[PDB]
Structure 1
Amino acid sequence: MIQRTPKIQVYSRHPAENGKSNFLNCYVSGFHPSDIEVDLLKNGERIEKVEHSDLSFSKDWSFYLLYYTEFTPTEKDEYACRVNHVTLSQPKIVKWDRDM
């Protein structure tokens, strides 16, 4: 059966400003089937309080989800999204770049 790989984007709800509350997003889309593991990471470790949107799909049947959590950016803290899916031979990690 059809297996499509997730596209992944990691980004903030508002433009990041150090010290100001925000949300960290990991948007996964374009994927099939729907079973997907998404973790947000703060300095390499799993953030526990992470929520997600309700599973939906695009005109081409491929799924999308938004994972998110509240965060306050700093100059030092590094954030990432770590994704596993049947299409990925190992978990894919995408670093948050405050300009992407």
Structure 2
Amino acid sequence: MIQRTPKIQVYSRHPAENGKSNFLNCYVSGFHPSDIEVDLLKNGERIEKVEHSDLSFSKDWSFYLLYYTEFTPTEKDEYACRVNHVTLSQPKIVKWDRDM
């Protein structure tokens, strides 16, 4: 069947400043089928309070979802998004870079 691997962007809702509450987003898009595992990580560990948007899709029928959680960015804490999908041999981890 049709299998499309997810695109991933990891980013903050607002320009990141250390010490100021923000939202960490992982936007997964372009994938099919819709079953997907997405976790937000803080220093490698799964963040427990993570919400996601209602599943929708694009003109080519590929799906997209936003996963998000409140976070307070700091200088030393590392954040990332971990995605697994039928198209991926192993989970893909994308690190948050405040410049992108």
> How far 1:99 moved relative to its partner?
0.3
Cα distance between partner residues in 2 of 1:33 and 1:99 = 31
> How far 1:36 moved relative to its partner?
0.2
Give 4+ residue runs of structure 1 displaced > 6 Å after superposition: none
> How far 1:7 moved relative to its partner?
0.1
Q: Which residue of 2 aligns with 1:43?
A: 43
Q: Which residue of 1 aligns with 2:55?
A: 55
Cα distance between partner residues in 2 of 1:88 and 1:15 = 31
User: Matches of residues 10-49 of structure 1 in structure 2 within 5 Å?
Assistant: 10-49=10-49
Cα distance between partner residues in 2 of 1:5 and 1:47 = 24
> How far 1:64 moved relative to its partner?
0.0
> How far 1:80 moved relative to its partner?
0.2
Cα distance between partner residues in 2 of 1:99 and 1:77 = 15
Render the CA deviation track for 1:71-97: whole Å, top value 9, x for unaligned.
000011000000000000000000000
Render the CA deviation track for 1:26-70: whole Å, top value 9, x for unaligned.
000000000000000000000000000000000110000000000
> How far 1:4 moved relative to its partner?
0.1
* Structure 1: runs of 5+ lacking an equivalent: none
TM-score with structure 2 setting the length: 0.99
How many positions carry a matched residue from both structures? 100
Cα distance between partner residues in 2 of 1:16 and 1:76 = 13
TM-score with structure 1 setting the length: 0.99
> How far 1:12 moved relative to its partner?
0.2
RMSD (CA atoms): 0.3
